[PDB]
Write a protein that binds this ligand. Structure first.
Ligand SMILES: CCCCCCCC/C=C/CCCCCCCC(=O)O[C@@H](COC(=O)CCCCCCCCCCCCCCCCC)COP(=O)(O)OCCN
Ligand SMILES: CCCCCCCC/C=C/CCCCCCCC(=O)O[C@@H](COC(=O)CCCCCCCCCCCCCCCCC)COP(=O)(O)OCCN
Lengths: 246, 246
């Protein structure tokens, strides 16, 4: 198997250095957040969503530092396109959990509405179509990217509805500022996901593998570590409000 | 890109014929079920889960008859392993919806418990690990298959709990026989999914591409078309019971 499109070049030895540094920073942040969540589960209240997302992010970052360009994480394909399977697998593992966290922002409701079901179905669909577009190499890539755009538009509409509902159910004060910050982080990072797809090697080859890895690491820290930490803080504030007033 | 493991052989020209015949049968069954579900949505009650699963199955069967060995549906990989991406993408699209149907068997409850959330997370994880094992080529394949086995064991435990809960909430009579048949179909087909993985080219190369396609088509008809039709019949019986008694 030669396929000269496999060797190519992943970066410029400076994007590689930035990617390694950001991977170390993400690993450290995920590890520290995991110890913090373990301590909180021991003492305070803690949700399973943030812990699961942090654990998956830590595992993904370790595998990205070690074997990002190896077969399970990087599919090389007969078309000459190196597909970052690790990215989309981690998306499938985390983003549904992030939206399960988005529903029931206040970690108090035990049940989930059908809007959550539509959210999850649309998100799984949009990640599936994004992966297929990454592996689709051509006009099929454009078709599957547009399918993912439609699914992600539905996902964004449902997520915006969930964010408005959370903003209104949450107590007035610090809680709504935390909800607004969560919404900002969520929408910016989840809208940079398709932007990075377009700019990355999976779309127009502008960002290269290492630059795309750098950008995806940054918005991965934003969308999962920082967003999960803000969700945990929102849950802590809600628990305090329930203890005092409720 | 030569990679002599890509050409190989997909079947014996009889497994190919059986695969084509079963694809035509699945396409016809999905089309007829789609007209039936459209008629039911027009006249009777009909759930979105069965319609969505049938539509995805019809699209998947069309793409399997036409471009099953083409790049978007078949990733060829630098390792020489032809990965059936269409299979795992369709799994990610349907199986979560099948489990959303498994929760709320009686199409009456608007809310979903955290057990449904765990079901969906475990199922997405098990499909992700199955895809990674299909692309992982070696001891990494075994490791990811075992990870998928753990996730699918959790999924099966939660699905069994959901089936017992549905069997007990459903009215006594035809409804519980339909629930039992749904449970039998679900567990047999979803347990043949890893059996077919083991026997297929993604595991031990015993079934070949065409034989694996034949088996997956059969248990795809069982797990999605027949199971969805039985779920629709259960919902129809429950609606009749509500109309008469409830
Ligand atoms: C994740 C995997 C990525 C895969 C990569 C490849 C796939 C490509 C697709 C990925 C994503 C593609 C999406 C692009 C299309 C998005 C267009 C879209 O649907 O836009 C969505 C929203 O998404 C956005 O990003 C636009 C931002 C607007 C929403 C921000 C505020 C709402 C929530 C904030 C709550 C805090 C304040 C609440 C009240 C404040 C005071 C009362 C439209 O809602 P909506 O707006 O109509 O809501 C109902 C409300 N009228
Ligand atoms: C889908 C994508 C496939 C990916 C392929 C590669 C990934 C490989 C993994 C895929 C699947 C891997 C699973 C293999 C290992 C799973 C074994 C396992 O976990 O087994 C699970 C599930 O067991 C079964 O598979 C069969 C369940 C028996 C039926 C029970 C529910 C039906 C109820 C309906 C009618 C019954 C009447 C109810 C009451 C009657 C009156 C009292 C253990 O629950 P459980 O049994 O302890 O429950 C709690 C009950 N005590």
């Amino acid at each position: 198997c030669y396929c000269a499109g496999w060797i190519e070049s992943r970066g410029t030895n400076g994007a590689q250095t930035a990617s390694n540094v950001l991977q170390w920073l993400a690993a450290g942040f995920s590890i520290l957040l995991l110890m913090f969540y373990a301590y909180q589960t021991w003492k305070s209240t803690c949700g399973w969503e943030e812990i699961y997302v942090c654990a998956i992010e830590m595992v993904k970052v370790i595998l990205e530092f070690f074997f990002e360009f190896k077969n399970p994480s990087m599919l090389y394909l007969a078309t000459g396109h190196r597909v970052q399977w690790l990215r989309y697998a981690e998306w499938l593992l985390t983003c549904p959990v992030i939206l399960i966290h988005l529903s029931n922002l206040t970690g108090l409701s035990n049940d989930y509405s059908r809007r959550t079901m539509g959210l999850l179905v649309s998100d799984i669909g949009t990640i599936v179509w994004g992966a297929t577009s990454a592996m689709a190499t051509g006009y099929v890539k454009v078709i599957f990217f547009c399918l993912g755009l439609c699914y992600g538009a539905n996902t964004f509409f449902h997520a915006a509805k969930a964010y408005i509902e959370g903003y209104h159910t949450v107590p007035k004060g610090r809680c709504r500022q935390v909800v607004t910050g969560m919404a900002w982080l969520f929408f910016v990072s989840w809208g940079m996901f398709p932007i990075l797809f377009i700019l990355g090697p999976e779309g127009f080859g502008v960002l290269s593998v290492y630059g795309s890895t750098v950008g995806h690491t940054i918005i991965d820290l934003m969308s999962k570590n920082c967003w999960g930490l803000l969700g945990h803080y929102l849950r802590v504030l809600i628990h305090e409000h329930i203890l005092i007033h409720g």
